[PDB]
Amino acid sequence: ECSQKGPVPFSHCLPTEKLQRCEKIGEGVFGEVFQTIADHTPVAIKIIAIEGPDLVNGSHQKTFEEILPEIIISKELSLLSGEVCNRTEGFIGLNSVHCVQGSYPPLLLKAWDHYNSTKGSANDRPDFFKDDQLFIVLEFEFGGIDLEQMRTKLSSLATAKSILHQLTASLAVAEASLRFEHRDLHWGNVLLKKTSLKKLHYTLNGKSSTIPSCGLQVSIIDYTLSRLERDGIVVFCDVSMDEDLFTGDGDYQFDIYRLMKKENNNRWGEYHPYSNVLWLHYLTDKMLKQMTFKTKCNTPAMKQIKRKIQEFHRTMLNFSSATDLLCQHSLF
Numbered sequence: 001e002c003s004q005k006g007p008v009p010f011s012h013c014l015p016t017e018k019l020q021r022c023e024k025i026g027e028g029v030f031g032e033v034f035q036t037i038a039d040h041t042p043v044a045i046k047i048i049a050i051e052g053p054d055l056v057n058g059s060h061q062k063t064f065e066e067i068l069p070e071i072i073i074s075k076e077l078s079l080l081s082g083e084v085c086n087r088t089e090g091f092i093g094l095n096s097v098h099c100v101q102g103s104y105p106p107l108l109l110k111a112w113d114h115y116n117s118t119k120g121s122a123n124d125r126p127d128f129f130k131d132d133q134l135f136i137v138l139e140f141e142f143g144g145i146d147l148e149q150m151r152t153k154l155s156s157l158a159t160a161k162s163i164l165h166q167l168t169a170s171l172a173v174a175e176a177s178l179r180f181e182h183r184d185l186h187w188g189n190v191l192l193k194k195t196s197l198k199k200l201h202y203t204l205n206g207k208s209s210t211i212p213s214c215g216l217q218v219s220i221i222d223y224t225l226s227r228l229e230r231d232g233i234v235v236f237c238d239v240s241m242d243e244d245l246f247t248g249d250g251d252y253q254f255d256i257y258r259l260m261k262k263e264n265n266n267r268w269g270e271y272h273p274y275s276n277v278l279w280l281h282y283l284t285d286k287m288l289k290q291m292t293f294k295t296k297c298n299t300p301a302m303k304q305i306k307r308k309i310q311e312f313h314r315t316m317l318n319f320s321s322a323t324d325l326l327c328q329h330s331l332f
């Protein structure tokens with residue numbers, strides 16, 4: 001809703017010594033995603049034009065009223081970390097949200113240039129921004145590095161059960177708490193951070209439980225398409241009249257976009273948590289078909305886990321929700 005009396009300059013959020021640690025880690029049509037350090041403490045920033053009457057990175061510029069949803073979602077999913085009945089951390093925590101004004105900080109264009117050089121950008125260079133330009137700036141806990149980039153780096157299929165378990169547990173709680181669909185859980189939006197912790201903890205509809213961590217702490221991101229309600233008030237991204245999302249493939253990912261629309265009949269207001277099961281199946285696929293493990297499955301026990309996950313893959317599309325998976329499916 002509000003954090004200030006009006007718009008502020010970039011230096012409020014990104015003082016000099018912070019801007020000098022800013023380093024781009026991701027992007028979308030909305031804008032850009034940078035890592036930095038704040039008081040000895042890493043943080044992901046998300047910067048997003050607003051009220052701009054000109055086209056940015058392709059689409060138009062979301063209004064304040066249009067960007068609010070994402071905030072609400074981000075805040076609500078963060079609260080979960082410290083709730084009681086429906087509790088999970090397997091999302092990412094918002095530390096701050098500020099409306100910023102001015103042209104783009106040159107130091108950040110240096111960071112944007114480096115990204116585009118080593119990796120390539122689908123967005124235009126943000127040098128065309130004026131000094132009257134308003135942005136929103138979301139500052140989050142820093143979750144880790146996404147699964148795609150973490151393929152060679154996983155250790156065993158054990159680790160894969162742990163992640164899938166963690167994701168389901170999270171989505172279940174969000175279903176339970178907020179009636180939540182993520183609607184875009186590509187292996188890009190699943191972060192992993194090493195944790196010395198030996199067991200993670202969550203609570204679903206009042207029941208507490210653990211999940212062996214296998215040295216990893218999974219965090220979910222990118223609430224760009226996500227959905228939820230509190231008090232019968234739904235907050236969601238309408239894509240009914242979008243096309244590109246459902247038209248375009250290569251990877252199995254792109255079939256999910258089609259499948260969701262098949263599920264919900266192109267009415268995106270409605271609550272269909274199968275959407276979460278789909279995305280979970282997609283991820284199980286990824287776990288089985290394009291992951292490469294530091295330890296090889298050549299031991300009777302790692303075979304057993306393999307089988308246990310294949311059986312998960314085939315069986316799981318016949319459950320109605322992450323909740324249902326978590327409770328009912330015999331992987332857990």
Ligand SMILES: Cc1cn(C)nc1Nc1ccc2scc(-c3ccns3)c2n1
Pocket residue numbers: 025026027033044045046074092140141142143144145146191220221222223
């Ligand atoms: C900033 C953020 C927070 N939400 C809920 N969605 C976000 N969007 C993106 C987009 C691309 C990438 S690549 C690494 C991140 C990280 C976020 C936190 N730690 S890393 C990321 N975040």
Ligand code: NI
Pocket residue numbers: 012098
């Ligand atoms: Ni402030």
